[PDB]
Every structure is written in C-alpha cells, then in structure tokens.
Amino acid sequence: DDWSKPLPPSERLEQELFSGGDDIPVEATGNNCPPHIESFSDVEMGEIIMGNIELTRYTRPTPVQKHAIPIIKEKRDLMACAQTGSGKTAAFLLPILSQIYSDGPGEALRAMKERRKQYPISLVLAPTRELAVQIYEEARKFSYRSRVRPCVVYGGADIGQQIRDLERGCHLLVATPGHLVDMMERGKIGLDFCKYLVLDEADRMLDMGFEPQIRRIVEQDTMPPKGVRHTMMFSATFPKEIQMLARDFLDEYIFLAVGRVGSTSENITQKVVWVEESDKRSFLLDLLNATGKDSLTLVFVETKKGADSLEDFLYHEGYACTSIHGDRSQRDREEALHQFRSGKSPILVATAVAARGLDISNVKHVINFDLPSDIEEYVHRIGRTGRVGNLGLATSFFNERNINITKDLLDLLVEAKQEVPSWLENM
Template sequence: MSTRTSWADLAANSAAENVTAGSSANNGAAGTTSAPGRSTYVPPHLRNRPASSDPPAPAPAPAYNGPVASNDRPGYGGGSRWGGPRNDFNRSGYSGGRAGGWGGGRSGGWDRGREREVNPFEDEDDTEEQAFNEQENTGINFDAYEDIPVETSGDNVPPAVNTFAEVDLGEALNQNIRRCKYVKPTPVQRHAIPISLGGRDLMACAQTGSGKTAAFCFPIISGIMRGQAPQRPVRGARTVYPLALILSPTRELSMQIHDEAKKFAYQTGVKVVVAYGGAPINQQLRELERGVDILVATPGRLVDLLERARVSLQMIRYLALDEADRMLDMGFEPQIRKIVEQMDMPPAGVRQTMLFSATFPKEIQRLASDFLASYIFLAVGRVGSSTDLIVQRVEFVHESDKRSHLMDLLHAQRANGVQGKQALTLVFVETKKGADALEHWLCINGFPATTIHGDRTQQERELALRSFKTGNTPILVATDVAARGLDIPHVAHVVNFDLPNDIDDYVHRIGRTGRAGKTGLATAFFNENNASLAKALAELMQESNQEVPAWLTRYAARASYGGGRNRRSGGGRFGGRDFRRDSSFSRGGSDYYSGGSSSAGYGASGGYGGGGGGGGGGYGPGVTSAWD
C-alpha cells in the first residue's frame, strides 16, 4: 500500500544503522605544501632566510630582521613536540578569565598556549564514540572508491596518492591522523592533497562529508609547520597576522571547520582561531591576541576585524573558501572581493588559493577564476550522498496538505523508531517565519522540534543544533542556513518541506544525510509552485539512479520554460565540470589557458553511466569525461 510506510522503514533502518547521539568528524587525509617555481617570487616560507624583501603589501614597519614581532611564535622546530618557548604576546591587558592556574604571570611565556591546549581527542574516549569512529572509517566502503568518477584538468596535474604514507605531512600531523583513525585518504584527499602540496591553486568539487575539510587543512597545517617561522611585521601591537585564512558562509560551518582544524593541528604548534558574528567580539579578540596561524571566519566579522586593524592579511600564504560557490553568489561576492582583493592580502599566484564546493555553476567558476592562478580543476563524485546512498523521493503535496503529510511521515517513522529513539529528521523550509511556525505546530502536536534560522540569536542557533545532534530534539526545522556543509551524524531523513528554487541548494540540503557511507532518505514535497525546478530535479534524480515519478517527468517536459536558470550547472554530474573546457568560455586562448591536460580518473565506472549527457547539455564539442 502506501509507499510512505516503506520510506519510514528506510528511515528507521538508516537510523538503526547510524545509532544516535554524539558527533564526530569524518573527514580524513593528508598533505604538505611547498610551492616551488611560481614565477620569480619565492614565498617567505620557502626561503632559508627570514623574509626580508618584497612583502606583498607595504608594511608600515620594515623591521623584519629585528626581534620577532609581538604575536609571532617561535619556529616550528622540526618535529619537536614542544617547539620551544613561545614568546610572550603583547597582551598586557589580558586578564585570564578563562584558565585557572595560569596566574597572571605574563612572565616566562612558557608556551601557555600549547600547554593549555585542550586534547580534542579526549571526548572521544567513551566507547560509543569510539565505536562510531571505527564504524565511520571502516564504514566507508573504500573499495567503492575505485568506482568514484574523478576528473581533473589543468597543467601538469600532480598524480594522486593512495596512502597518507606517500606524502610527508610531518610526524605531529600524522599522529593526529592516526588519532582521528583515518586509515586511508578519501578520493578528494587523494587528489587534492598532492595538488596542494605541489603549491598549486585548486578549484575542487566534492561533497562535504567526503573529507573536504581535511583535504585543505592538512596541506595548510603541514605547510605552516614546515615553513620558516614567519617574521611578522609590527603594525600595532594589537594587529595579528594569520598565515592562512579559511572562509565559510555560515557561523556554524565556521565553528565546525575550526573544531576539525583544531584536531588536526593538535600539538603541532599551529594555532587555529575562529571568528564569526553573533558572538561577543571581545573573546574572539583575546583569542586572536594569543596568536593565530590559521584564521577560520565568516566574512562579516572578518571585515569588521580588518577595519579595526586587529587582523592583517598581509602574511597570508593560504586562502581557502569553503562552499565557494555560495561565497561568490550575489549576496556574498562584494564582501569576498573586498577581503581578497581590496585589503592587504597577497595577490593570486603569491598566496596559494583553494576553492571547495559540492556545486560549481559555470558563472561562479568564472568569477572564482579571478582569485586563482593557473589552477587545477578537480571534480570527485561523492562517497555517499545523492548518488547511491541517499534514496530520493518526491511526493506531490499541495501547499495546504504539507503539514499533515509531514505528520504522517513522522508518525510512521516514530512507529518504526529504534531503541526508543526517534530517527533524526531535518526539515527544510523556505522562510524564517515558516520555520518558526512549523516548529510550533510540530511541538503542539507532540513532536519535539526545534529550529535554526537567521532570525534566532546565535545562542539559540547553537543550542538548537546541539539539541538536534544529541537526539534530544530529533526534529530540526531549518532554513538554508543549515543547507551547506554541516556535518550532523546520524541524520536519517531530510525532508524538503519547501523545495528550494535552485537545484544546487537541493543537492546541498539532501547532502546532510547519507554521509560517510551511511544510507539516508530524502523526501521532497513538490507542487505547482515548484514547476521551475521540475526539469533539473528529474535530471538529477535520474543521474543518481533514482526512481523518477511519471508525473514529475511530465512536469519536467512541460516546464521547459524554466529552462536555462535551473539547468544543472555546467551540465555535469555533481556540478563538477571545468568551465574552461566549455567552448563558450574559452575565448581564443587568452589568459584562460587553453592547454591543460585533462584526465578522467579510475575507471569510467559503468555504474555512473546513465545518460545524463543529453539533458544537461551545453558542452563544447569533442569534450569527453568520465561522466559523459
């Protein structure tokens, strides 16, 4: 009878498989960085002497060879765990507040930062968490990787590696990789790490949850560890000079990246600090003053810090944009341009730049190429997500029936609940008001729900997310703030209560389930208001071997007027196709570099066959790839 029941079964199964509560990172990989031969400029960290010339931007104080500047830390002495005493920072006003036992002494500066460093692995001691980790790492089906389509294009693409051992990341980082129980690099890591270690710029399409964070963190951390201890200029005692900047579009995602990066950087001497809005700035300022090598930030707060001259980007060696296509869309682009092009950041080609996202529309690739120099494009099929591991269903539900329909799904799911725990269900809606309304309605109908959206305070947002992750509140109603990047283990079911207008947003939303090799279920409520999405949705589902309802196919055919806008970005699977290879963009060999080699990775995997080719459209003639 009703297919509904079987969906609930799916969700329940998925939940059973995933258990509940607790969260853990599931990225993993390795890398190091060196950047040989980029024209004539030799990055400071590759010199065997202190950087003393051509600073990227005029420094107020040329005193580079003087004593190490205020917020510098001593060298990352090779391999030595305690790299030596840390200079005291110029933070006269620092008044503890946090630590006990670190008495006001600003004296010896015996590296309190590091000694105080919280062991990020401690909380994983409990067996349950341990079990998750084991499961998650062995749980990823590594054999299946051989079937994951990979495409690279660009000049002299460094070959992929098969193990972490093949790349020299340094002992401290290797130890953290072991602590994270990362056995083998994921596909995106296998390719991105050597590219990054080779000093190359990178534009990478890969789903979050496939190991993306580690793919850009490892080379950055390794590169900083190996680099010459930076001689940072003195601008003002309170200005800090991070060596790496990681930007992301939401506060929660920045927090998540920060948490992961802290694990990877544990006892490496590399300091990771996060800055985002909605939280008191003073505490963030104090953290910054204690020294920062890698700054993770959301754009607004960073601009604030830059304008206050509390942060300078002059020493940036690495720039990473996570969810890069979102960062460059209309809402964010001006801020990003300001940060990257109009402050004191070294230009493309001097710094190393890495852009990551699961989706990369052509137009955005074109914008993004401003930030890159002779970059390599990498597209990796997802480990799980929207391909095999997520079962996608679309139901025709009139606007007025949505609530009761959702209720039916939840009821069935609860009936099938495992171990008395309800499966985690993430419900996406279009508006903030709609989120509040639905949350309220669910609560008064006996379903414990909470909500996350931009009108809530940061405290409320974080509480909601925590409560959901732990299973305390097994239903989370969210706007697109939660659509990207968030790694919430054990989400069994994503419901698109309101479908997004953009197919890429759909891809990101359903990517919140089916992570790290787990199965997941994604249900969408479709009605006449979503006509413009029909074509792209039907194509996407077909590409990922999903059952496409006949009525949706009819809608898709009818709704050809929806045309251009919602077509799959670039026509490729996973939004992954180098725009430079599209004839309409290759303007007669100008700076867009026409040469590049291109290769399709391991096996054009029959499994991914299925003819997306025709529908997506728009390729230049004669272009082939693993996905064609």
C-alpha cells in the first residue's frame, strides 16, 4: 500500500473542496535551525501535496510557512509565535501530511488492518469549534487523492454524527480538549500511535481553562513521549505558563517569532474603575446600556449565589440574559450555553470555575463584576475577548477588596500599554 501515489481523482469532490482564491521580520532561536525556504518546491513534499497546493491556487508560502515548514520536515519540535491570519494552519498541516505520505501508516496500523476504536497518527488541538472546523476543512483540501482521512470532534448538536465519522476511519484528528478527553474515556480514541501533536492557539486554550485536559491528553495517557512524537505549539503570545508548557511538551525545540511578540494581548482594551459593592449593579446597568447589537457579554462573579442574585436582577430589569453556575442542573447549563452562543441571551453571568472548559467563543465584552485574587486568573478571563481583527473590551470593578492584586494589576496595564487609573498607582 503506497501512501505517496495519489488515488484516482473525483471531479465531484474537487469542485466541493477548491472553489476559492509580506515581509514580516522573523526571528528563530534554537540549536541547528534548518534554513527557511522561499518556495514550496524547495523541499520535496511529494506528488500529493504539490498537486493539492496547485488546486488551492495559493502558491507563495507565507513568512511563517517559510520557516516552520522546513523545521517540521526535518523532524524538529517547533514553538512558533504567530498571529491568527499568518497561515499557521498550512504551516503545520503541509509538512505533517507530506511525511505521512512517505512513511505510510506505520507498522502498528498496518498490522491492525487484518464501534471500532480509532488510533490517529496526528492530533491537532484547538480551543474553539470555529477554529477546529477551519483546521479540519484545510486538512480535507490537503488530503485529497490521499489515503489519510481527517476527522473533527467539537461537540454541539451533531456530536452523534461526529462520533460516526470517527468510526469510518481517522488518521488525523482535530479536536477541542474537553471533547477529546470524553472521546477517550468512552473508548473511541486511542493515542498509542500518535506521531504528530499540534497545539494551535495554545495561549487561548489555557485562557479557556483547558490545561488539565491538555496535560491529561498529552502526559497522563498512552501518547508517545517527546523525542518519539513530533510536537508543534502555535501561540500569539508567550507568557510564563506557555513557556512552562513548551518546556514540558517540546524536546530541543526551535523558537519562531513572527512579528512583534509579547506576553500580553495587544488586542484588548482594559478599563479599571473604582466601584463600591452596593454600586456595582447600577454601574453594570450603565455598561450594558452602552452595549451595541449582537455583542456577546460575559460577566464574571465570585460565587454561585452571586451569579444567582445577579441574573435575577438583570432579567427583572428587562435584559435578555442567562447564567451558568454550580447550583444549576446539567440540562439548564447546556441550554444557557446554547442561548448565549445563538445570541438569544447575549449576556452570560457565570463564575470563572463554571466557565472553564466550556465551548464559549466570540465574546466581545468581558466584565469582571468581581475581581479574582490572582493576576494569573485575571489574564485568563480577559483572554476570552479580543481577536486579530476585532478589539475586545475588558472592564473590571475594583474596590478595597482587591488591594492584594493592586501592584500586579498595575504592572500588567503598563506592559499592555493600557490606560492606568491615576489612583491605582497610589495604593
């Protein structure tokens, strides 16, 4: 079974997949970095990949593709810092799929050929359903006329059909961490033969609360260790927790910096206002009355009974809202999520612990009704808003109960080049 020979073409499938169609400074750091290429033909990618690249009508490799692709093709771990929209997806999908076409399905899967559990060769983790579907559809384009079969698992109403497509064969799996863990405990996915692990938008994944699930997938199961598996991490920022995750997950990696890379999100506006406890409700009402149309707002409160009280207050003032917290049943929490995702209830009151690991995406305004006691968790909360194109907003209510975080909060506002309240510097 030759996995480099392209299968016969399907003119029907071609029309479905292919119907569409500069010098950012790059800094590489590491031991013996393979040199960047200038065109896709500068590396033998194979008959299948070259043929699919021509079908996508995209022939000039992006800067991040110029450096990341030869690093992966030389079986080297990669920690790349690039913003969403630079071509990260193809940068890891193309060399991974090219090597699988040369190596074949390995000896383990070949022996196993003679509800069926699937053992993917490549695992790609993503924070959101939106990005998971995007990576999946690109993988379909680059596995055309190939024997590699990609799948995606991201939950939602059609998770039953996603479990189905798994059982039709899966060599490359795109998933969000929480649903992948569920697939693993249900005996539908095994990682014993995963040779390629990709963590895309890893800073966002940790912001959404997925780190326990990710370390469960990567360290506490049957995935081959670093030095056997080839691992790639992409992340727009490089904070200390991403440093530590790279150090744990990567083996003698190359660090790639596309553009001005920092540790804060340069796509978030942070407003900190002093609000006493008894004034927080009136202040929130003023913020919400400035909220536009189709604007998903996430309000963090400290306790379940606080999310309890606030949602009751907001609904009786006429606001379309919902709440997720521990004192609500499972079914009520899944419906709260759907109404938030659909925009029927665009204001979601939640405790931070209840929102961790939930399919919450496209948040435009993060409101810290109550602030946390760690600057680490604060960074996590506001990371739920902001994107490469849209500037997110993070408003926080601050009073005497938050003097512990004063110094850390001021240092973060200055580093992010945000407005610093003149009072904050004094306490």
